[PDB]
Design an enzyme around this catalytic site. Structure first.
Site, PDB file in Angstrom:
ATOM      1  N   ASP A  24       0.316   5.349   1.830  1.00 44.85           N
ATOM      2  CA  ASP A  24      -0.458   5.723   3.006  1.00 44.85           C
ATOM      3  C   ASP A  24      -1.573   6.659   2.725  1.00 44.85           C
ATOM      4  O   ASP A  24      -1.396   7.633   1.983  1.00 44.85           O
ATOM      5  CB  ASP A  24       0.449   6.355   4.066  1.00 44.85           C
ATOM      6  CG  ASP A  24       1.284   5.305   4.812  1.00 44.85           C
ATOM      7  OD1 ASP A  24       1.103   4.047   4.663  1.00 44.85           O
ATOM      8  OD2 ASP A  24       2.103   5.779   5.597  1.00 44.85           O
ATOM      9  N   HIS A  62       0.862  -1.214   0.000  1.00 39.80           N
ATOM     10  CA  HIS A  62       0.000   0.000   0.000  1.00 39.80           C
ATOM     11  C   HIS A  62       0.861   1.213   0.000  1.00 39.80           C
ATOM     12  O   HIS A  62       2.098   1.116   0.132  1.00 39.80           O
ATOM     13  CB  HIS A  62      -0.919   0.026   1.219  1.00 39.80           C
ATOM     14  CG  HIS A  62      -0.178   0.154   2.496  1.00 39.80           C
ATOM     15  ND1 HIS A  62       0.552  -0.899   3.052  1.00 39.80           N
ATOM     16  CD2 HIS A  62       0.029   1.234   3.298  1.00 39.80           C
ATOM     17  CE1 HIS A  62       1.135  -0.478   4.170  1.00 39.80           C
ATOM     18  NE2 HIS A  62       0.820   0.805   4.357  1.00 39.80           N
ATOM     19  N   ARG A 101       7.375   9.251  13.365  1.00 34.45           N
ATOM     20  CA  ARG A 101       7.010   9.520  12.014  1.00 34.45           C
ATOM     21  C   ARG A 101       6.561  10.954  11.873  1.00 34.45           C
ATOM     22  O   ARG A 101       5.753  11.401  12.682  1.00 34.45           O
ATOM     23  CB  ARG A 101       5.784   8.591  11.769  1.00 34.45           C
ATOM     24  CG  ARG A 101       5.038   8.887  10.480  1.00 34.45           C
ATOM     25  CD  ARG A 101       3.894   7.962  10.259  1.00 34.45           C
ATOM     26  NE  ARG A 101       2.970   8.645   9.392  1.00 34.45           N
ATOM     27  CZ  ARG A 101       2.447   8.143   8.272  1.00 34.45           C
ATOM     28  NH1 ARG A 101       2.692   6.925   7.880  1.00 34.45           N
ATOM     29  NH2 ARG A 101       1.633   8.873   7.540  1.00 34.45           N
ATOM     30  N   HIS A 143       4.715   0.329  -0.031  1.00 40.08           N
ATOM     31  CA  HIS A 143       5.503  -0.336   0.951  1.00 40.08           C
ATOM     32  C   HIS A 143       4.764  -1.470   1.602  1.00 40.08           C
ATOM     33  O   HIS A 143       3.535  -1.638   1.434  1.00 40.08           O
ATOM     34  CB  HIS A 143       6.065   0.658   1.990  1.00 40.08           C
ATOM     35  CG  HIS A 143       5.040   1.448   2.734  1.00 40.08           C
ATOM     36  ND1 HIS A 143       4.539   2.636   2.238  1.00 40.08           N
ATOM     37  CD2 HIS A 143       4.424   1.241   3.924  1.00 40.08           C
ATOM     38  CE1 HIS A 143       3.650   3.114   3.093  1.00 40.08           C
ATOM     39  NE2 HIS A 143       3.568   2.295   4.131  1.00 40.08           N
TER      40      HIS A 143
END
Ligand SMILES: O=C(O)CCC(=O)C(=O)O
Ligand SMILES: O=C(O)CCC(=O)C(=O)O
Ligand SMILES: O=C(O)CCC(=O)C(=O)O
Ligand SMILES: O=C(O)CCC(=O)C(=O)O
Ligand SMILES: [Co+2]
Ligand SMILES: [Co+2]
Ligand SMILES: [Co+2]
Ligand SMILES: [Co+2]
Lengths: 274, 267, 287, 289
Positions: free
Chosen positions: A96, A94, A259, A244
């Site tokens: 994000d 996928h 993140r 990823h």
């Protein structure tokens, strides 16, 4: 190409590169930044080993790529709202948050505490996925759009497994099947199995063969690389032109990352020209 | 709306029984035109109780288009346009590996089981028309490579004239019927190999989707064969399926083939 | 057959039964032949049977007791008789347009259904049937041995449970009751291979409408096998197609057949009345 | 665990870097036993800085079992036991091994192992994927396992050098690949779907898309869904590792309990490796009757 201010070691013939010879604790001069940006544009996922940085420094590095927003999301770090904790969607390929009208352009992730072995992340290039399709396949699908939603992740279809907000889970957005990256100018495929429901204007049944073929085609091993995380590694990935995959082969060990998200614009076929 | 024949449709999609006509006799213009109308609408038509001769079968067939003087090994002695068919079980239409496959087939039951040996038919008009407009627009311009390689060419030989088996032709994925003017899907699993310009991997999901979509039961009818029944099917806009549930019984039919023009998107 | 006339529809299943008046009680000899024909042909139809509700009910009772199906609306005056009805103007979900047998989400699904045409199109509205004996018998010995011990999880989740509620394709209020979602989600397990309690024959028992997974397997693990069996059982040669005429009575075996409702009559009224005969838990043996 | 070698695992599933050893030298018993332990556990092992000669490559290989060359590959010059994996700068033909497979499963007794050494390899590009068939097997539900454990599978080389290959257009180059017999390409053998490794005693799945045709006793239609499911299940990224080659790296893989995948992301560059193949015994469900 020529790098004078950084050292770049490509990971594969398709994407991924190790960047060294820089200290991300420090501000980056213009020439060094410009080389990092061109390495990002070329290699699509880049990683910086040995960068024992702070939250503010992670945030300031992120801001070089584009805007990063005062988010205060549930997993925001206290005192540093642009940074989220990632403590361990996931194990399907996928990219994000494609259910948003304007998903992230990039993500900058830092290892805080990670296994000595296990917990790799797969990446792949959607430029390469697009470019290995036949001209006829390309012409056939280039004009299609795809309906994205979070319904299988946190909307009604998720809830209907019996054993965030449901309206927000079900809200649909539409993106082009083929997108032009606003920085590189390159075309890439843009579809994923986590969030894509159907082709706009088609039924699910009609859409399934095409979407399934594109999922299988994009994820061939030769379009892929595999990034190993070490403590203090900083990874930046392009959220438009890569996908990823989180590898969960570290049962029983702590994995903590931080993140930040860099904001993008609406994915599009072009940004005011062809 | 039919004055010269009686038409009883078999389902809401395709197939019709035609009575009130004697195929031993020449057909006047008005009667022929109604039969052709019924053919164009119902796509597979059957005439019970037509104890006709070979020349009469041939003459009826000639009203639909040319039927060719050329014998085959299975030609009836003295009547080279008529072939004996003695006994398929994937959905197909006949001989799509040719640049110009048959337009129609006219089959007459000679000696057939009391029960068993039905033939399934389906409408490719209806297969096409139940696709969304967007799906239609997306695939309408594609062409498909047909060959007999899996029936009598190299791929067949590798699992079990070979050059003729391997020779490829290309047809549109969507065809306009030259008589009705209607668009129908044109693909089948027996002879279609790939989409022109695409790899096999690229092609297979779309072709398999179209095969599954076209063959839903509601797009279908089922024809039972009785002694002296004459059946005509449109070889462009239908597909058929031979049901083999009559092990150990004789099934003999005669067939003529009506020649067609190259399948095309427009005439 | 001495008491009835039996005309098989195909080489696999289905038969027309004539020489019988279902308005009347059936003597033992005639009933036994009808039951023989039912066991052999699996779906049987009786063309000219202008019968009343009580007579329909009494004929049904010869097969077993009456146990109404959860989803369907009863006719006024007769709780045991249920409608299959679609109106001229209806565009919603059509009852029965994937291959299935009825109500397999129950611990004990119907053994049989007896359905009578009230008002049906002159052309259109056929029902497909298939034999699960033949589906089973055409599998290789090795495939048979591999799957004979498996069981399958059934539920109504896609018909009136959570997965139904989560999608947009909706049944009309016309023939169909308001339903409980938990009852839609409730799971039951049946064998993959069942022994018919009257004929003693083995048949495959799986369907795409109600089957979710193989018991003990994940959905992903189950999907290849289930998809293969759905495609295998529904090949045209395992099938027959029944045309309805006014006052035709059809009886089908709900254990060893599946059926398929054909909707090729957009814009026309179709009404049939139906009684459901109760059965026992599907099983691999009755000893 | 390890006193004589240094072992650095590559992932949580399989693969390990072995250092602190000089493969130019004979190995004492204690050092060999640790290497064998590591091989049995990690399934694919690699030794980075090993500028060895052909005789030394051969002698190291012999510690694993006898040398039995693979049918398809060209031998190097002075050494029939050492075979090339080679692709030229110029080459556009079929790439050797770019589907998940293990080697030569069409044989009644396929190789137990392969030891491959980098001679001249790209600076970036030409990785090899590996995966564990132990982990593929172990992530199936108990019920799925019990359902298929007794099945056997028909293998042949028909799509590689038999009739199905001859019938299609995607062609191998003369470069690394011998001229081959079509009858030998079509010859069938049967192996269990689940095999017991004769050294570790562990069960692993044994199926691959290159050589498996059908399940023994089943039709192709019956077989295809099960085989396709197993191919997709075994090749999930989390069951996998990726080995990067450096000059003089020696890699040894278990040909029974792993599969591998050649990555072709080095268009226009020379890649040469040399390889010896160690013979094994008939794959079987048990080595105890
Ligand atoms: O844990 C990771 O490496 C990335 C996980 C992921 O899928 C994400 O946060 O986007
Ligand atoms: O049952 C039939 O008459 C159709 C035979 C057939 O399929 C063919 O014409 O290839
Ligand atoms: O309407 C029909 O043909 C049958 C519908 C059905 O599935 C049923 O009544 O169980
Ligand atoms: O070239 C590679 O990376 C491995 C190719 C392969 O399958 C082999 O050597 O057996
Ligand atoms: Co993610
Ligand atoms: Co035919
Ligand atoms: Co039903
Ligand atoms: Co190999």
């Amino acid at each position: 190409q020529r790098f004078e201010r950084i050292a770049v070691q490509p990971l594969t013939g398709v994407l991924g590169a190790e960047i060294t010879g820089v200290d991300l604790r420090e501000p980056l001069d213009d020439s060094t930044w410009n080389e990092i940006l061109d390495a990002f544009h070329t290699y699509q996922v880049i990683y910086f080993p040995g960068q024992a940085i702070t939250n503010e420094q992670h945030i300031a590095f992120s801001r070089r790529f584009g805007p990063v927003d005062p988010v205060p999301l549930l997993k925001s770090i206290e005192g540093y709202p642009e940074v989220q904790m990632i403590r361990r969607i996931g194990d399907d390929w996928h990219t994000d948050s494609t259910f948003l009208d304007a998903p992230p352009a990039a993500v900058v992730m830092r290892a805080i505490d990670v296994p000595e072995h296990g917990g790799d992340t797969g990446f792949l290039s959607m430029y390469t996925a697009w470019e290995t399709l036949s001209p006829t396949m390309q012409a056939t699908i280039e004009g299609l759009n795809v309906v994205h939603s979070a319904t299988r992740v946190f909307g009604s279809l998720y809830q209907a497994q019996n054993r965030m907000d449901v309206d927000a889970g079900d809200r649909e957005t539409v993106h082009p099947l083929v997108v032009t990256h606003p920085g590189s100018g390159r075309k890439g495929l843009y579809v994923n199995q986590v969030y894509c429901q159907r082709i706009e204007g088609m039924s699910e049944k009609e859409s399934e063969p095409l979407l399934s073929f594109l999922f299988a085609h994009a994820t061939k091993p030769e379009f892929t690389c595999r990034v190993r995380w070490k403590k203090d590694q900083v990874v930046v990935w392009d959220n438009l032109c890569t996908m990823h995959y989180a590898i969960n082969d570290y049962h029983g060990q702590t994995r903590i990352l931080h993140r930040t998200t860099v904001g993008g614009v609406r994915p599009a076929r072009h940004h005011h020209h062809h």
